[PDB]
Amino acid sequence: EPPQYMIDLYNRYTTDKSSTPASNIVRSFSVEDAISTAATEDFPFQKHILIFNISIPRHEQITRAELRLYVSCQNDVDSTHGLEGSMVVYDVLEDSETWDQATGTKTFLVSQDIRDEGWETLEVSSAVKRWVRADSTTNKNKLEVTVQSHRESCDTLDISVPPGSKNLPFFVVFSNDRSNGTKE
Amino acid sequence: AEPPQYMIDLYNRYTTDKSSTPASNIVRSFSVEDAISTAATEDFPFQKHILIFNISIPRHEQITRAELRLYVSCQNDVDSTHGLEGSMVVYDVLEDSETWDQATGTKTFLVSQDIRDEGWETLEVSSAVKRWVRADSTTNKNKLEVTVQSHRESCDTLDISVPPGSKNLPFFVVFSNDRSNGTKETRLELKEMIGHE
Amino acid sequence: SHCQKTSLRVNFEDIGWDSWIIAPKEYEAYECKGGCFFPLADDVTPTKHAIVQTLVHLKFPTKVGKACCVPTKLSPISVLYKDDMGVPTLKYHYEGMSVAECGCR
Amino acid sequence: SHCQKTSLRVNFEDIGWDSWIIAPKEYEAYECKGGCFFPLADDVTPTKHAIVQTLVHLKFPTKVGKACCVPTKLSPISVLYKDDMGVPTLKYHYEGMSVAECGCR
Ligand SMILES: *[C@@H]1O[C@H](CO)[C@@H](O[C@@H]2O[C@H](CO)[C@@H](O)[C@H](O)[C@H]2NC(C)=O)[C@H](O)[C@H]1NC(C)=O
Ligand SMILES: *[C@@H]1O[C@H](CO)[C@@H](O)[C@H](O)[C@H]1NC(C)=O
Ligand SMILES: [Zn+2]
Numbered sequence: 001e002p003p004q005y006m007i008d009l010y011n012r013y014t015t016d017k018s019s020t021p022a023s024n025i026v027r028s029f030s031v032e033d034a035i036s037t038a039a040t041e042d043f044p045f046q047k048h049i050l051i052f053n054i055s056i057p058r059h060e061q062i063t064r065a066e067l068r069l070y071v072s073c074q075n076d077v078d079s080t081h082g083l084e085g086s087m088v089v090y091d092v093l094e095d096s097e098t099w100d101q102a103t104g105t106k107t108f109l110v111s112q113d114i115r116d117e118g119w120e121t122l123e124v125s126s127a128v129k130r131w132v133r134a135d136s137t138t139n140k141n142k143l144e145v146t147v148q149s150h151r152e153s154c155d156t157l158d159i160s161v162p163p164g165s166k167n168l169p170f171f172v173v174f175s176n177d178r179s180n181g182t183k184e
Numbered sequence: 185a186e187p188p189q190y191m192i193d194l195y196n197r198y199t200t201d202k203s204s205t206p207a208s209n210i211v212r213s214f215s216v217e218d219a220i221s222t223a224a225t226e227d228f229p230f231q232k233h234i235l236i237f238n239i240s241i242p243r244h245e246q247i248t249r250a251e252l253r254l255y256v257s258c259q260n261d262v263d264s265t266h267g268l269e270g271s272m273v274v275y276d277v278l279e280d281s282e283t284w285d286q287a288t289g290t291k292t293f294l295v296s297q298d299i300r301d302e303g304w305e306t307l308e309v310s311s312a313v314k315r316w317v318r319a320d321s322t323t324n325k326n327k328l329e330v331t332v333q334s335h336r337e338s339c340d341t342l343d344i345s346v347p348p349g350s351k352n353l354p355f356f357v358v359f360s361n362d363r364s365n366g367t368k369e370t371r372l373e374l375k376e377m378i379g380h381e
Numbered sequence: 382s383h384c385q386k387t388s389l390r391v392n393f394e395d396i397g398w399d400s401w402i403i404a405p406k407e408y409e410a411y412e413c414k415g416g417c418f419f420p421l422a423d424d425v426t427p428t429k430h431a432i433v434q435t436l437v438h439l440k441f442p443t444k445v446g447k448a449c450c451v452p453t454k455l456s457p458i459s460v461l462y463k464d465d466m467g468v469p470t471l472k473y474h475y476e477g478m479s480v481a482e483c484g485c486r
Numbered sequence: 487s488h489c490q491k492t493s494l495r496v497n498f499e500d501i502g503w504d505s506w507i508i509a510p511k512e513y514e515a516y517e518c519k520g521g522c523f524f525p526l527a528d529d530v531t532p533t534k535h536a537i538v539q540t541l542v543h544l545k546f547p548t549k550v551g552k553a554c555c556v557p558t559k560l561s562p563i564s565v566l567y568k569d570d571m572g573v574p575t576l577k578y579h580y581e582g583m584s585v586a587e588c589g590c591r
């Protein structure tokens with residue numbers, strides 16, 4: 001059930017004992033729900049609205065947050081013509097029940113050019129910091145990821161998302177205690 | 185021997201239901217070790233007393249206040265019912281000399297005190313003790329000179345009770361606190377208990 | 382029983398501390414009586430090691446002992462005494478003389 | 487004896503903490519064995535109350551027990567585990583898991 005990333009981090013932290021981590025507390029948050037929209041002529045890219053349930057104690061000061069995605073050409077024929085593209089993640093402030101990027105209000109986080117099939121790491125600490133300080137006005141705690149394939153590439157270059165069950169997205173929040181371990 | 189009742193009275197004061205907690209947590213009493221007394225002369229018409237103490241306060245302690253308590257009394261004199269009036273001054277002795285008392289050496293003025301009633305007087309001489317703690321090992325201190333000046337209509341032999349007498353001798357009262365707010369002091373307290381254990 | 386603070390008056394002559402303690406000659410020192418039995422509740426402020434060892438005790442009671450009931454916080458008292466050099470010393474806060482809280486460690 | 491730190495390996499399967507502790511599977515928690523017998527030396531960092539209570543026990547062994555040998559300082563370990571919500575949590579310093587120093591209290 002826990003990601004191998006978390007286990008690798010433990011092995012990393014316990015191996016390199018001569019080097020202390022920048023963040024003492026690390027948590028893993030799997031995706032709660034996903035709304036996927038295929039590419040259209042008006043919007044030639046894959047749209048994914050990812051909903052998480054990140055809840056970090058207020059006595060904790062978060063340092064860094066990672067969004068790990070599995071980029072893969074979804075088992076298509078004639079995929080051997082190459083594999084090149086890019087993906088962009090936006091922090092969603094205002095949503096709407098029509099389409100994905102074709103509505104709402106977003107703040108740009110990270111742009112990532114992709115090549116190798118596999119896991120990518122996107123530093124989206126900014127959004128999580130905004131999610132902790134919710135202020136209860138806008139419906140957040142969610143973000144949208146778009147996957148753009150370059151010319152002469154895979155038809156369905158995308159990230160593995162629900163309702164699939166293999167290599168699903170998840171958050172990694174790096175945090176430390178403000179009271180230096182007293183309250184935590 | 186036993187500690188002065190002044191220390192006991194301070195304890196009783198602290199243990200009684202006082203609404204005011206003391207300014208200093210640590211209080212010590214240091215009796216006089218030796219005293220050099222010179223009677224009044226024509227050149228210097230006053231009683232001269234050089235008082236030597238053995239005050240030793242830990243360097244981890246920050247002292248707040250020091251009191252020099254003296255017993256002013258007309259020393260069993262004839263015509264002692266003619267009054268008791270005068271003044272006394274204490275100097276921190278910087279440089280000494282084996283000739284006379286005030287007629288030599290180097291002094292820093294501390295306290296001037298007009299006296300009337302026979303009994304104990306209290307002189308706030310915190311200044312001198314602070315210099316004694318910060319010795320710097322250059323000048324010979326840890327001692328002070330007290331002079332007693334009698335007025336016209338007073339006792340013939342107005343003085344303070346000092347050695348070689350044995351009644352109501354002078355003593356120091358040092359009010360102190362710990363610099364590390366009790367961290368370093370309680371450590372030295374503990375090592376004392378294991379020694380007493 | 383259960384780890385809790387109990388009363389305990391200490392006369393210094395009985396322990397021989399009358400040889401240097403001028404006052405109060407006798408005081409309330411308190412005592413932590415009782416045992417640290419499973420489960421360890423919040424009222425003894427157990428540490429993780431105390432919790433671990435207790436759980437180990439349940440598993441191996443013949444090899445590993447339970448946590449001990451000890452003073453967690455200590456309160457000072459007013460003490461008038463003589464220094465090692467014989468110097469009369471009065472301390473309004475003489476730290477660590479009486480039990481404030483008890484706990485399992 | 488002498489209040490001292492001894493070895494103590496803790497398998498989380500034995501205490502049932504394998505249900506939430508992902509890593510490690512077992513660790514060195516250490517243990518404070520021995521008794522606080524007179525006199526209490528510097529090497530057990532005795533408190534004034536511990537000294538008092540020890541002297542009282544010698545005087546009144548039927549009324550007052552000796553000080554207990556307990557962990558004075560505790561050292562953290564690295565722990566990977568699941569939160570109450572099932573959230574995988576990794577803590578480089580999981581405080582209070584192993585004994586650093588022992589002492590008399
Ligand atoms: C997301 O996490 C939050 C925790 O903050 C969950 O909120 C709980 O929801 C239940 C639902 O009845 C309440 O009874 C609890 O009181 C809530 N806890 C808090 C701390 O508010 C929420 O259920 C989670 N969502 C999902 C889909 O798992
Ligand atoms: C004076 O006090 C010091 C404190 O450091 C002590 O060592 C010394 O024995 C004392 N001397 C006399 C004569 O009391
Ligand atoms: Zn927290």
Ligand SMILES: [Zn+2]
Nearest residue numbers: 076077078155
């Ligand atoms: Zn195709």
Ligand SMILES: [Zn+2]
Nearest residue numbers: 085086112113
């Ligand atoms: Zn590009």
Ligand SMILES: [Zn+2]
Nearest residue numbers: 225226227228
């Ligand atoms: Zn003349």
Ligand SMILES: [Zn+2]
Nearest residue numbers: 242244245369
């Ligand atoms: Zn001191």
Ligand SMILES: [Zn+2]
Nearest residue numbers: 270271297298
């Ligand atoms: Zn005058």
Ligand SMILES: [Zn+2]
Nearest residue numbers: 269270335336
């Ligand atoms: Zn006059």
Ligand SMILES: [Zn+2]
Nearest residue numbers: 266336337338
């Ligand atoms: Zn006259």
Ligand SMILES: [Zn+2]
Nearest residue numbers: 418438442447
């Ligand atoms: Zn038991």
Ligand SMILES: [Zn+2]
Nearest residue numbers: 366457474476
């Ligand atoms: Zn205090």
